[PDB]
Amino acid sequence: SHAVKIYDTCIGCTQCVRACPTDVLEMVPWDGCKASQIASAPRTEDCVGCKRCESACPTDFLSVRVYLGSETTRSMGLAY
Amino acid sequence: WKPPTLDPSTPSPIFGGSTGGLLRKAQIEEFYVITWDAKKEQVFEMPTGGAAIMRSGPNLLKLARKEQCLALLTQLRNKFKTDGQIYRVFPDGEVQYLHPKDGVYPEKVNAGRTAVGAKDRSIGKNTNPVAVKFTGKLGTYDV
Amino acid sequence: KKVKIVVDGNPVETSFERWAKPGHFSRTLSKGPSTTTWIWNLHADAHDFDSHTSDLEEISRKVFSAHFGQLGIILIWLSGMYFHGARFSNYEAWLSDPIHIKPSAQVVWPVVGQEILNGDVGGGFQGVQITSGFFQLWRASGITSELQLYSTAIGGLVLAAAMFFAGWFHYHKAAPKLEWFQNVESMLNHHLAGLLGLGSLAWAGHQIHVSLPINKLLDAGVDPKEIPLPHEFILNRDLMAQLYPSFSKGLAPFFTINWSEYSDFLTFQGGLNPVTGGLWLSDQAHHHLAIAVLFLVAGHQYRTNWGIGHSIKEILEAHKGPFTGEGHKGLYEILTTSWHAQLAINLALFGSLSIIVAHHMYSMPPYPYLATDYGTQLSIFTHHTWIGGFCIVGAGAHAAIFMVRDYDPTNNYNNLLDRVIRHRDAIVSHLNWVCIFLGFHSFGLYIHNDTMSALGRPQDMFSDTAIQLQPVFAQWIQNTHLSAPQFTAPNALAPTSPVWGGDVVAVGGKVAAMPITLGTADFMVHHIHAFTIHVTVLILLKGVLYARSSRLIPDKANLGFRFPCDGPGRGGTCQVSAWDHVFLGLFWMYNSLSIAIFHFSWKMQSDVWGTVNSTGVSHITGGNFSQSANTINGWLRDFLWAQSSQVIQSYGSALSAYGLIFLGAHFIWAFSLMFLFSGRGYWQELIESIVWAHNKLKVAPSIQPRALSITQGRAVGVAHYLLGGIATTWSFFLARIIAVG
Amino acid sequence: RLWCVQVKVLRPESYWFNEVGKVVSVDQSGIRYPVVVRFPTVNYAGVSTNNYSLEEVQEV
Amino acid sequence: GDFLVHHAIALGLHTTTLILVKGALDARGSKLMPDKKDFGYSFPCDGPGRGGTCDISAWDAFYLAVFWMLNTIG
Amino acid sequence: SGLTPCSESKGFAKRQKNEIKALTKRLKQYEEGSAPSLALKATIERTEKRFANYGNAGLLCGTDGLPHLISDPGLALRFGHAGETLIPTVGFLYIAGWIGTAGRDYLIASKGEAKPREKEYIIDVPLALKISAQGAGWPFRVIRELQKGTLLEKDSNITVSPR
Amino acid sequence: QASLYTHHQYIAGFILCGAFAHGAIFFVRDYDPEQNKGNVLARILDHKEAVISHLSWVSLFLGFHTLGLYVHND
Amino acid sequence: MFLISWRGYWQELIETLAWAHERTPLANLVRWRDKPVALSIVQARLVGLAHFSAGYILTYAAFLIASTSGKF
Numbered sequence A: 001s002h003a004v005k006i007y008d009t010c011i012g013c014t015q016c017v018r019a020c021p022t023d024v025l026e027m028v029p030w031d032g033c034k035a036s037q038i039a040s041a042p043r044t045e046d047c048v049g050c051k052r053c054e055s056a057c058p059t060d061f062l063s064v065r066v067y068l069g070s071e072t073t074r075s076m077g078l079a080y
Numbered sequence B: 001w002k003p004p005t006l007d008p009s010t011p012s013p014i015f016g017g018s019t020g021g022l023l024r025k026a027q028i029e030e031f032y033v034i035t036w037d038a039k040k041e042q043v044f045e046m047p048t049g050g051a052a053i054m055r056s057g058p059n060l061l062k063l064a065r066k067e068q069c070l071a072l073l074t075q076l077r078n079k080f081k082t083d084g085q086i087y088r089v090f091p092d093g094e095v096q097y098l099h100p101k102d103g104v105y106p107e108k109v110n111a112g113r114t115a116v117g118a119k120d121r122s123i124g125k126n127t128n129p130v131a132v133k134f135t136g137k138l139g140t141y142d143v
Numbered sequence C: 001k002k003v004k005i006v007v008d009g010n011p012v013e014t015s016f017e018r019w020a021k022p023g024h025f026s027r028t029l030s031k032g033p034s035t036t037t038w039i040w041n042l043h044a045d046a047h048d049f050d051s052h053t054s055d056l057e058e059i060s061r062k063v064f065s066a067h068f069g070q071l072g073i074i075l076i077w078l079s080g081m082y083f084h085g086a087r088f089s090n091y092e093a094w095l096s097d098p099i100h101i102k103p104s105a106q107v108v109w110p111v112v113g114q115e116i117l118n119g120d121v122g123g124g125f126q127g128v129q130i131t132s133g134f135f136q137l138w139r140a141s142g143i144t145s146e147l148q149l150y151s152t153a154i155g156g157l158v159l160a161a162a163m164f165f166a167g168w169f170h171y172h173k174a175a176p177k178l179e180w181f182q183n184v185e186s187m188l189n190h191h192l193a194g195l196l197g198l199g200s201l202a203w204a205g206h207q208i209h210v211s212l213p214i215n216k217l218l219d220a221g222v223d224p225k226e227i228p229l230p231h232e233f234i235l236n237r238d239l240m241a242q243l244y245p246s247f248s249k250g251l252a253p254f255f256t257i258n259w260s261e262y263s264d265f266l267t268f269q270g271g272l273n274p275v276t277g278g279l280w281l282s283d284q285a286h287h288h289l290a291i292a293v294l295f296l297v298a299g300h301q302y303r304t305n306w307g308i309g310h311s312i313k314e315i316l317e318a319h320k321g322p323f324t325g326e327g328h329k330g331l332y333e334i335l336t337t338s339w340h341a342q343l344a345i346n347l348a349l350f351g352s353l354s355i356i357v358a359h360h361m362y363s364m365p366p367y368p369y370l371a372t373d374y375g376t377q378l379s380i381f382t383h384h385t386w387i388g389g390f391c392i393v394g395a396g397a398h399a400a401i402f403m404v405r406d407y408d409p410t411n412n413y414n415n416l417l418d419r420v421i422r423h424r425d426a427i428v429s430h431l432n433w434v435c436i437f438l439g440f441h442s443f444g445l446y447i448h449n450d451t452m453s454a455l456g457r458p459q460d461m462f463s464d465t466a467i468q469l470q471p472v473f474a475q476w477i478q479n480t481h482l483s484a485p486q487f488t489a490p491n492a493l494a495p496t497s498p499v500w501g502g503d504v505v506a507v508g509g510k511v512a513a514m515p516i517t518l519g520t521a522d523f524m525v526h527h528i529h530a531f532t533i534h535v536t537v538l539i540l541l542k543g544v545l546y547a548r549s550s551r552l553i554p555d556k557a558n559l560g561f562r563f564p565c566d567g568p569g570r571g572g573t574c575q576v577s578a579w580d581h582v583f584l585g586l587f588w589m590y591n592s593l594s595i596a597i598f599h600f601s602w603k604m605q606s607d608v609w610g611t612v613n614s615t616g617v618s619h620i621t622g623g624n625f626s627q628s629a630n631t632i633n634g635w636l637r638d639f640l641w642a643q644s645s646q647v648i649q650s651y652g653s654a655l656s657a658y659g660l661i662f663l664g665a666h667f668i669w670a671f672s673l674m675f676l677f678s679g680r681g682y683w684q685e686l687i688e689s690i691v692w693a694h695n696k697l698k699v700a701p702s703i704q705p706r707a708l709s710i711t712q713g714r715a716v717g718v719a720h721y722l723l724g725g726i727a728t729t730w731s732f733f734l735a736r737i738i739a740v741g
Numbered sequence D: 001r002l003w004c005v006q007v008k009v010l011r012p013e014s015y016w017f018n019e020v021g022k023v024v025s026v027d028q029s030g031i032r033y034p035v036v037v038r039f040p041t042v043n044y045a046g047v048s049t050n051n052y053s054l055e056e057v058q059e060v
Numbered sequence E: 001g002d003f004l005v006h007h008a009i010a011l012g013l014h015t016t017t018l019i020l021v022k023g024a025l026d027a028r029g030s031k032l033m034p035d036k037k038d039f040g041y042s043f044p045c046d047g048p049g050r051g052g053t054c055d056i057s058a059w060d061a062f063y064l065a066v067f068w069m070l071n072t073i074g
Numbered sequence F: 001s002g003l004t005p006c007s008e009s010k011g012f013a014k015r016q017k018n019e020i021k022a023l024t025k026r027l028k029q030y031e032e033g034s035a036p037s038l039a040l041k042a043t044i045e046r047t048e049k050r051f052a053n054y055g056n057a058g059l060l061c062g063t064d065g066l067p068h069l070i071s072d073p074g075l076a077l078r079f080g081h082a083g084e085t086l087i088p089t090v091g092f093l094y095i096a097g098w099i100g101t102a103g104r105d106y107l108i109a110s111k112g113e114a115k116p117r118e119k120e121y122i123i124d125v126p127l128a129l130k131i132s133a134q135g136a137g138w139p140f141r142v143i144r145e146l147q148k149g150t151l152l153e154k155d156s157n158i159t160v161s162p163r
Numbered sequence G: 001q002a003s004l005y006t007h008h009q010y011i012a013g014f015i016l017c018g019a020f021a022h023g024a025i026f027f028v029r030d031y032d033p034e035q036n037k038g039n040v041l042a043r044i045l046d047h048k049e050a051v052i053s054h055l056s057w058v059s060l061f062l063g064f065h066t067l068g069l070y071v072h073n074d
Numbered sequence H: 001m002f003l004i005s006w007r008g009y010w011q012e013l014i015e016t017l018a019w020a021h022e023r024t025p026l027a028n029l030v031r032w033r034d035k036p037v038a039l040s041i042v043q044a045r046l047v048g049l050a051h052f053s054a055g056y057i058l059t060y061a062a063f064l065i066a067s068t069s070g071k072f
Ligand SMILES: CC1=C(C/C=C(\C)CCC[C@H](C)CCC[C@H](C)CCCC(C)C)C(=O)c2ccccc2C1=O
Pocket: C674, C675, C676, C678, C679, C680, C683, C684, C706, C707, C708, C709, C710, C712, C713, C714
């Protein structure tokens, strides 16, 4: 499965969660940013690795990072 | 809030069938079920190709991948303003409820969620790969 | 309900304000650049009218006025072609001697030594030899002087200015409304009866009254200056009746239905004129008259304003069966609301028409002295083949664009489009199997032959003197078409073409046309053609069918028609877009059409073209197609290595420009591989280092330099690949056939 | 730290490292990266603003 | 002729060296990918974001330079 | 380098004779006073003038009868070959510095405007013509900026990637 | 003689490509910036833009002028 | 082919092929152990480079040896 990490530069804009096609990400309460929320990745076993979340992230550098790892049926996006 | 249970007697949308549906993986590995309650009978686009008619009231569709179910749910939420529930079904009959996991959509912040994968540093503070040699870790992001 | 003229008065102000604002048409691009990507995006999105606005009326008005602009540009190009024939050509000298004088209508200026390209083409003239066939077309029209070419050039520029006026007028002053454009029944009636039908009738009139008597006098041996002008044949009926005696009866046989009296100038001879090697002009006049009547009848099918006629929607909705669900229901709404679906259909049929035109123009040459001008024959065949292939790839592209942008599942439930989408996996898998089978049983025959020949076993080869693969169906068709004047078309004097069989048509000691026999090599190359066409179809059809979704990416329609990928996940999703399927189909169409034009060039040089002497026919390459075209080594040696000697020794002659273009096109093709084999991340990092160097000397631009986008990198790679390969074949073909023809 | 004051970015992974931007606002609720900086150039994502901590910006 | 082909050889050597050296020195990171050391020597890309990141790894620089080396030795 | 002057090279004279012979062979198929005859005669005259000018320029010819250029500034100066590479080097370097300085001055002038990116694709033509004419005196201004330290941006003001 | 020259030159080209590839692998995997603080390795990493840009310049000059001279002669 | 055409075309093609095998009688009796997928992006670059280099070397070796041997 791929590894998705969230770094503390996240501004809680929820764009990565909205961009995710497999529901890997969600917003949890936080206090390190003005929006009082941070992204989290509790379901990385469903991560395909499309990096739509990184395309959606506005911070510089990225607050959400996807590291491609070992490939399973879910991560390879196989319907067969 | 409690996780809903899957009702397998829920009617399916009016569909003539297609070659893009389930395969052997559904019988032996897993498949996915999306359920939604339609306000009215209307035509929607199948994620596997073609047009189907959703029935008024509850609907049940079996799909091969979670991404197909979430694409259909995105279409239902954006075009028909309809919420939905996604389940994972195993060949032994076990049903795992997936989305929305706590009843609130993941883009909306909800209390009771715990951050996983959070790092208390910016991405430029990751160590060097020579520091994780012969440690068994995945990489500098894993430490 | 009622077909009528509806326009809007003065919708768009004629001003230069938006000329000073690049990107004004786009909401995103109007804000100006931040990076260099904006420069490319402005040119890439300039003609995507449906991306600028969602209003179908504005799109239709833009399309109409752009079509007027294209017609004006085409008329400028044609008027320039007629002008260069009038002013910078040897057309009159060529008219006096069409066998020993090479056509030329381009003269270069003497500077930097380039006047060597003004070759000794004959007629006391120096210039670049042309292969477009304009001289033979002008001779067939009856043009005998440079003044008549001057008149056509001036009249073309006047009509070109009228087309540019009409484009300005129908966009800025009187722009038709959407309901005007959606009168497809009236458009079809007018374009069948009025455009094609009246065009064919008017050209039959020109042929009868001008082309027939002038070319009759030309083939009789009369000097072109002594031939009377066309209006002399118009005004003096006795001068017309001297050549065609039925003109003494006037129009009375036409109106008394004594049509057989006109048999002297309305003929059904068939075959070729032995003097000129072209089709009989009387045959062409009768052809165009019959075509005119057929199209005038065809243009009265659709109901507009007087009750009678067909409704296309009713015809489409009535044609449904048990296997096909709702049938053609909803196709009328697609084809009256989507410009891209119409463009897909029209591009497919126009490209197929161009390829059919190439085959019919080589086989039945319709211009005098066209067939013995081997450079012109090869050039027009190759050109129209390439135009056809490009248009077919464009048809695939715009079918995919329709599927992404204009497809609506609500209006397509259980119709033909929905049912085709619903079994796309079966279609693609069966086509994939057909392509694999065709590739094996066509290319593996060549590999088997190359291995057998290299193993010293020519008796185990696939050849005429070995294991034979005779194309018996095509041979039977040839025999049937040779025997057509006997029974199945008794009023035709000759077969349609000499390629079916019979005698050799020779003009000036050179073969105009002759039978084209088919053997094992023809069988093998025809199945190679079938294989390559099937693979190109597979790529383009897979792009159309999976443009909206697949098992890999279920929401591909939300990503658009043209996007690079969906990231390295799911194993990697590079080139999933329908645009990338067009991008690969361009390569495969190039491969297919390259083999088609190579087959044409080698087969006509080996078995058709040549010199007719007293003993017989000596071909250009001496019949080596049937001996060696069944191996890859035979192709590489006897076609590629042997026939490229003319382009590589063209230096120091008038053909040296072809050698330079040969080298430069090899360069451009090689240059394309850096775009195709690489990716933009490397180039962006290299640009970062270069930008650092520019920042050090305070010469960093405000418009930030970026590497090309992934899609632009693919587009640049395929464009330079096509340009390099096609221009390589172009220079090789033209140098070879001008030097040896 | 002030309003519309030129600052130099010291974050090494930032696109605008060693570059000068304008301070838009400074958050006072104790968040991790309170300084909002506007830059005259866009990064590779087309963004012109980023948030920095107090130690990541130097007034120039 | 020896002059011209020797300068062609110099172009080949310098370009192959440029690709390889840029790949080695940007292996740890660039402005497009400042954390490239976290992803290793060989990886496909970083996705279509930030303009597109095809062939951004140092392995890809080796792969590009093999073409130029083959051209140079040719 | 063992070469001979082209004015006394037998290969040079043979090449001139062969080129004139080929052009004269092409010339004999046209009547006198016609346009092809005049064009071929002009080409013949240009060929003769070119061979005479190359012989008179002191060019050295190889065994192939073709002129060979000398690019070492020592051998060019002491043997009269400076017009082959050295003087063209000076001329090119002057024009290239002119173009580069004009571009740099235009970029620096456009940097100070309210819309610096606007002047990069919509050219300030009067300003570009004024700056372009001022590029004749580029070496003086460039060498002064080099001595003053204003030609180079400081390393602290230039972005770099993490190392 | 031709076979031996061509063989050993292609072998040398592949080996040089591998040398630079494993230099890049060292920089990704084994390079410790703190252990190499201020030495020649860190200093050549610290002006990599100058190195890459000057290599780009010399490659561009050689390619432009060698190709231009060849095309002029052609 | 491996250097110009990239992955996602081939993965969708292989998806249709995997559909075809499971739906074909007398052939769905046999089945794969490893799910057929297209070659990865890096693997494709490597395989295309290997075919390119092998063709380069084999072509030039054949030409060099034949052209030097046939005259000497
Ligand atoms: C070489 C290459 C580049 C680099 C090429 C670039 C950046 C294009 C450069 C085009 C021109 C030459 C840049 C400058 C354009 C200016 C308008 C020209 C001004 C100069 C005056 C003389 C007119 C990519 O960006 C790329 C991206 C994706 C896949 C492959 C590749 C690829 O192969």
